[PDB]
Design an enzyme around this catalytic site. Structure first.
Site, PDB file in Angstrom:
ATOM      1  N   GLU A  87       0.679  -3.655 -10.591  1.00 48.55           N
ATOM      2  CA  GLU A  87       1.845  -2.800 -10.541  1.00 48.55           C
ATOM      3  C   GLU A  87       1.653  -1.552 -11.391  1.00 48.55           C
ATOM      4  O   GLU A  87       0.818  -1.535 -12.301  1.00 48.55           O
ATOM      5  CB  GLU A  87       3.077  -3.587 -11.002  1.00 48.55           C
ATOM      6  N   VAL A  88       2.404  -0.502 -11.055  1.00 47.26           N
ATOM      7  CA  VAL A  88       2.616   0.637 -11.952  1.00 47.26           C
ATOM      8  C   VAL A  88       3.984   0.449 -12.620  1.00 47.26           C
ATOM      9  O   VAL A  88       4.980   0.172 -11.944  1.00 47.26           O
ATOM     10  CB  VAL A  88       2.612   1.993 -11.203  1.00 47.26           C
ATOM     11  N   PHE A 116      -2.918  -5.142  -6.065  1.00 48.32           N
ATOM     12  CA  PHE A 116      -3.870  -5.457  -7.123  1.00 48.32           C
ATOM     13  C   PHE A 116      -3.172  -5.417  -8.463  1.00 48.32           C
ATOM     14  O   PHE A 116      -3.782  -5.701  -9.495  1.00 48.32           O
ATOM     15  CB  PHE A 116      -5.044  -4.493  -7.139  1.00 48.32           C
ATOM     16  N   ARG A 171       4.220  -1.103  -6.713  1.00 45.56           N
ATOM     17  CA  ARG A 171       3.347  -2.266  -6.518  1.00 45.56           C
ATOM     18  C   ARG A 171       2.180  -1.981  -5.574  1.00 45.56           C
ATOM     19  O   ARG A 171       2.380  -1.486  -4.462  1.00 45.56           O
ATOM     20  CB  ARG A 171       4.148  -3.481  -6.031  1.00 45.56           C
ATOM     21  N   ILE A 183       7.898   0.576 -11.507  1.00 38.90           N
ATOM     22  CA  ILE A 183       8.084   1.669 -10.558  1.00 38.90           C
ATOM     23  C   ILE A 183       7.210   1.614  -9.293  1.00 38.90           C
ATOM     24  O   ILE A 183       7.362   2.453  -8.401  1.00 38.90           O
ATOM     25  CB  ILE A 183       7.937   3.037 -11.259  1.00 38.90           C
ATOM     26  N   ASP A 224      -7.708   9.871   1.371  1.00 37.54           N
ATOM     27  CA  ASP A 224      -6.413   9.363   1.774  1.00 37.54           C
ATOM     28  C   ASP A 224      -5.356  10.235   1.113  1.00 37.54           C
ATOM     29  O   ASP A 224      -4.929   9.950  -0.010  1.00 37.54           O
ATOM     30  CB  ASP A 224      -6.316   7.917   1.263  1.00 37.54           C
ATOM     31  N   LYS A 268      -0.669   1.717 -14.961  1.00 38.69           N
ATOM     32  CA  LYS A 268      -1.158   1.001 -13.803  1.00 38.69           C
ATOM     33  C   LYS A 268      -1.871  -0.243 -14.283  1.00 38.69           C
ATOM     34  O   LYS A 268      -2.684  -0.179 -15.204  1.00 38.69           O
ATOM     35  CB  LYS A 268      -2.101   1.888 -12.997  1.00 38.69           C
ATOM     36  N   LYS A 281      -1.572  11.609   1.129  1.00 40.71           N
ATOM     37  CA  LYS A 281      -0.266  11.273   1.658  1.00 40.71           C
ATOM     38  C   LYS A 281       0.817  11.710   0.679  1.00 40.71           C
ATOM     39  O   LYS A 281       0.527  11.939  -0.501  1.00 40.71           O
ATOM     40  CB  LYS A 281      -0.189   9.764   1.946  1.00 40.71           C
ATOM     41  N   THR A 324      -2.383   2.241   7.144  1.00 43.68           N
ATOM     42  CA  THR A 324      -1.903   3.180   8.157  1.00 43.68           C
ATOM     43  C   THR A 324      -2.964   4.240   8.438  1.00 43.68           C
ATOM     44  O   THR A 324      -3.614   4.753   7.522  1.00 43.68           O
ATOM     45  CB  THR A 324      -0.572   3.872   7.757  1.00 43.68           C
ATOM     46  N   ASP A 333      -3.006   8.340  -7.645  1.00 45.09           N
ATOM     47  CA  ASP A 333      -3.683   7.379  -6.751  1.00 45.09           C
ATOM     48  C   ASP A 333      -4.960   7.943  -6.097  1.00 45.09           C
ATOM     49  O   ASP A 333      -4.958   8.334  -4.927  1.00 45.09           O
ATOM     50  CB  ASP A 333      -2.726   6.809  -5.688  1.00 45.09           C
ATOM     51  N   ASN A 353       0.977   9.997  -2.527  1.00 48.31           N
ATOM     52  CA  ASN A 353       0.033  10.423  -3.556  1.00 48.31           C
ATOM     53  C   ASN A 353       0.434  11.736  -4.207  1.00 48.31           C
ATOM     54  O   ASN A 353      -0.244  12.202  -5.124  1.00 48.31           O
ATOM     55  CB  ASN A 353      -1.375  10.538  -2.987  1.00 48.31           C
TER      56      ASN A 353
HETATM   57  C1  LIG Z   1      -4.736  -1.116  -5.640  1.00 47.65           C
HETATM   58  O1  LIG Z   1      -4.117  -1.225  -6.884  1.00 47.65           O
HETATM   59  C2  LIG Z   1      -2.879  -0.627  -7.093  1.00 47.65           C
HETATM   60  C3  LIG Z   1      -2.109  -0.920  -8.232  1.00 47.65           C
HETATM   61  C4  LIG Z   1      -0.853  -0.299  -8.418  1.00 47.65           C
HETATM   62  C5  LIG Z   1      -0.371   0.614  -7.459  1.00 47.65           C
HETATM   63  C6  LIG Z   1      -1.137   0.924  -6.315  1.00 47.65           C
HETATM   64  C7  LIG Z   1      -0.653   1.911  -5.245  1.00 47.65           C
HETATM   65  C8  LIG Z   1       0.861   1.852  -5.092  1.00 47.65           C
HETATM   66  N1  LIG Z   1      -1.135   3.304  -5.390  1.00 47.65           N
HETATM   67  C9  LIG Z   1      -1.017   4.091  -6.622  1.00 47.65           C
HETATM   68  O2  LIG Z   1      -2.036   4.362  -7.271  1.00 47.65           O
HETATM   69  N2  LIG Z   1       0.309   4.562  -7.082  1.00 47.65           N
HETATM   70  C10 LIG Z   1       0.464   5.225  -8.377  1.00 47.65           C
HETATM   71  N3  LIG Z   1       1.683   5.752  -8.859  1.00 47.65           N
HETATM   72  C11 LIG Z   1       1.515   6.368 -10.221  1.00 47.65           C
HETATM   73  C12 LIG Z   1       2.622   7.011 -11.034  1.00 47.65           C
HETATM   74  C13 LIG Z   1       3.954   7.019 -10.559  1.00 47.65           C
HETATM   75  C14 LIG Z   1       4.961   7.611 -11.321  1.00 47.65           C
HETATM   76  N4  LIG Z   1       4.691   8.157 -12.503  1.00 47.65           N
HETATM   77  C15 LIG Z   1       3.427   8.174 -12.999  1.00 47.65           C
HETATM   78  C16 LIG Z   1       2.375   7.599 -12.280  1.00 47.65           C
HETATM   79  C17 LIG Z   1       0.155   6.238 -10.636  1.00 47.65           C
HETATM   80  S1  LIG Z   1      -0.722   5.478  -9.488  1.00 47.65           S
HETATM   81  C18 LIG Z   1      -2.388   0.298  -6.137  1.00 47.65           C
END
Ligand SMILES: COc1cccc([C@@H](C)NC(=O)Nc2nc(-c3ccncc3)cs2)c1
Ligand SMILES: COc1cccc([C@@H](C)NC(=O)Nc2nc(-c3ccncc3)cs2)c1
Lengths: 397, 394
Positions: A84-85, A82, A79, A77, A193, A100, A195, A232, A211, A198
């Site tokens: 993926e989620v 670092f 990226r 769901i 941050d 994550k 947004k 951004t 996040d 988040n």
């Molecule tokens: C820097 O390392 C990273 C690794 C993975 C993702 C990310 C970014 C996209 N930010 C983030 O935490 N996004 C998140 N989305 C969720 C989420 C989404 C849907 N349902 C439950 C949780 C958690 S963190 C950064």
């Protein structure tokens, strides 16, 4: 009040907030084994004998403790570069979570080895309806895993895509954001941050923050600075931009700026400081006195305009510096539908229709990684590449 | 699947992942990483600065040397000393063995205390001194044992002329004690008066198991090095130096023999003015063993001594403890084998305080500078053999 040194130590072992609690102590043992176990180092007798004793036991343990193979990936769901989620189901318990991943290899490579501690503390201990909870945090030699309540509503970026948003919806998401922010400010963090990305939604259509990777603990005066790159500067305040140039520090009012921006984007469909380029957006923020215009698109509310403008001013005169209350009392927030205390019990503007417990509708498809996993150069002496990750393990009970 | 079971792994005093071993891990790690050369690695510097405060705190919370008053120094084993100590809060008096980490490195021989710890902790025997706590710091291991105000047989032997009546008693007790150890799967070696202690009521306990070893199936051990006290060492163990052989639990019985000789004759059977001489007489025991010409000593006394000081394969006890118990030297109206520890010891020590040191020789203090470790330029893992040593009884 009095406890014996033995009692006190027992509390340290059992306390989820303690860095010496039992789970963190296994982490150390694990890491140490990971980092010691190599033919080169095994030439050291202390090391060889030690690894002989504990290794058979370490395999029992690695087998028993939670692990990536206790879950199967249903989908990807998001990226973060670092890692993926990804939507997951637990095999024994059937339960469904968001997970994550963080690449240890990538973190040693780029530095950025220390940045996930605040996210950990927040999702673990906030205990707020306004904040995504972390149920489990565990790890292996390759990755960190954060297992979180899944939020099938998707983020507010998706929402602004699929709906035009009336002042009645805006007011509502805005108010919830105010509350989640405040919750986080009361734990002593500045989000920094803030947004639509988040902001996610539960099956009820209610908002949580996720996040927290940017979050910093405020001190005494309630200020901070970090060295951190920011994707951004759309929602970023002027005084944060200046700070990155060495100039100085700043307080939680920086987060209220973002909210000022969030509102504008919801009503007007566009970021107020939007430009074709980063540099342009950047100049516009610094230009904010002269660069902020209310649309062609409308007349919208006198009150909405005034809130946005009160947030989008310079920090010293800015709304929220005297605390959350003057925000809550803003006439923009008056309605018959909800009160600040009752807000989460209201029915939400958009309540997700969901085919299943696996429904991905509000997320974009994330194709694939299928990249070959990078590995470290074999240590000739001890480099402790696992040390930065020791004490990360957490189990909610 | 329900699962955890790690609860039990963490809570089992015999488990190597138990809470205290886990803490020993972190403690060892920090000690071994903290150094100028090693802090040039950022991984390390960052870890140390992150855990430093919490580590200083743990060190203070957990059992430490500062928790004890040192009363007298009652022994020195060149791997350390033994102290009579009193807990500053509880006020309870204990014996504490100090093992130097520095020396058990320099001389190697880092593994021996495990079986000693194991035994003193879990034996649960009136024949074996009990370990209450074990802890450590960077310099030492500390074993805290029940105190034994009666002293050791050597002191008794210097202060008295041991009648056959007493020797029957003490030998019998040594026998029951050794049996218990054998039944736990260990061979003591090292049976000498210095390791036989008297409790407040005058009954005997075995201590100093640092030389113990675990048998296998046939109940033997394979050892190519000879183990201590030249006067008491068996021919097999002497000969086993130089790769020879592998042997069972009757070397202990050999020492019981030497013990009995010492009590009744007042000298050791293999005594000479060099150990070199003693090793030699032991190899030649068949000839070199003799009683004094005057002697008034029961024949069955000499017989039992002779049944022990023979070679291993004809040695009394080779068949079972029973053939020892049935020996005529133990025949008497006072006591029975199963009740023996409930009887009235020949010597019940008279004591001033719970602190009374009268039955131990005068010893003072090191007065020497601590001879301590060289600063590493790389991880030596110098504390690693000691992880899991800490023990708490409850
Ligand atoms: C820097 O390392 C990273 C690794 C993975 C993702 C990310 C970014 C996209 N930010 C983030 O935490 N996004 C998140 N989305 C969720 C989420 C989404 C849907 N349902 C439950 C949780 C958690 S963190 C950064
Ligand atoms: C192995 O390396 C060594 C280090 C220090 C000392 C020693 C000697 C003294 N033997 C020994 O363990 N003696 C013991 N005495 C007790 C005792 C004394 C008084 N009360 C109860 C027990 C136990 S072990 C050896």
């Amino acid at each position: 009040s009095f406890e014996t040194r033995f009692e006190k130590m027992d509390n340290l072992l059992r306390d989820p907030k303690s860095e010496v609690n039992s789970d963190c102590l296994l982490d150390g043992l694990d890491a140490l084994v990971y980092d010691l176990d190599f033919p080169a180092l095994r030439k050291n007798k202390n090391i060889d004998n030690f690894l002989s004793r504990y290794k058979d036991t370490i395999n029992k343990i690695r087998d028993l403790r939670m692990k990536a193979e206790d879950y199967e990936v249903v989908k990807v769901i998001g990226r973060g570069a670092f890692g993926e989620v990804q939507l997951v189901r637990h095999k024994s318990t059937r339960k469904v979570y968001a997970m994550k991943l963080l690449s240890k290899f990538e973190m040693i490579k780029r530095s950025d080895s220390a940045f996930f501690w605040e996210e950990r503390d927040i999702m673990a201990f906030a205990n707020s309806p306004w904040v995504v909870q972390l149920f489990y945090a565990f790890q292996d030699d390759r990755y960190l895993y954060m297992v979180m309540e899944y939020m099938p509503g998707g983020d507010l970026v998706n929402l602004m895509s699929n709906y035009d948003v009336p002042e009645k919806w805006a007011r509502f998401y805005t108010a919830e954001v105010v509350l989640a922010l405040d919750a986080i400010h009361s734990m002593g963090f500045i989000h920094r941050d803030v947004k639509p990305d988040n902001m996610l939604l539960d099956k009820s259509g209610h908002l949580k923050l996720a996040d927290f990777g940017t979050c910093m603990k405020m001190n005494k005066e309630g200020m901070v600075r970090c060295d951190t790159a920011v994707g951004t500067p759309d929602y970023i305040s002027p005084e944060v931009l200046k700070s990155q140039g060495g100039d100085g520090y700043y307080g939680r009012e920086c987060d209220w700026w973002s909210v000022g921006v969030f509102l504008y984007e919801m009503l007007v469909g566009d970021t107020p400081f939007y430009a074709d380029s980063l540099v342009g957006t950047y100049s516009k923020i610094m230009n904010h006195k002269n660069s902020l215009t209310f649309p062609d698109d409308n007349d919208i509310s006198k009150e909405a305009k005034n809130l946005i403008c009160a947030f989008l001013t310079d920090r010293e005169v800015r709304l929220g510096r005297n605390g959350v209350e003057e925000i809550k009392r803003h006439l923009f927030f008056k309605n018959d539908q909800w009160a600040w205390e009752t807000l989460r019990d209201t029915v939400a503007p958009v309540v997700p229709d969901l085919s299943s417990d696996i429904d991905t509708s509000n997320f974009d498809d994330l194709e694939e990684d299928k990249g070959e996993e990078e590995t470290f150069p074999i240590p000739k002496a001890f480099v402790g590449n696992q040390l930065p990750f020791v004490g990360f393990t957490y189990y909610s009970n």
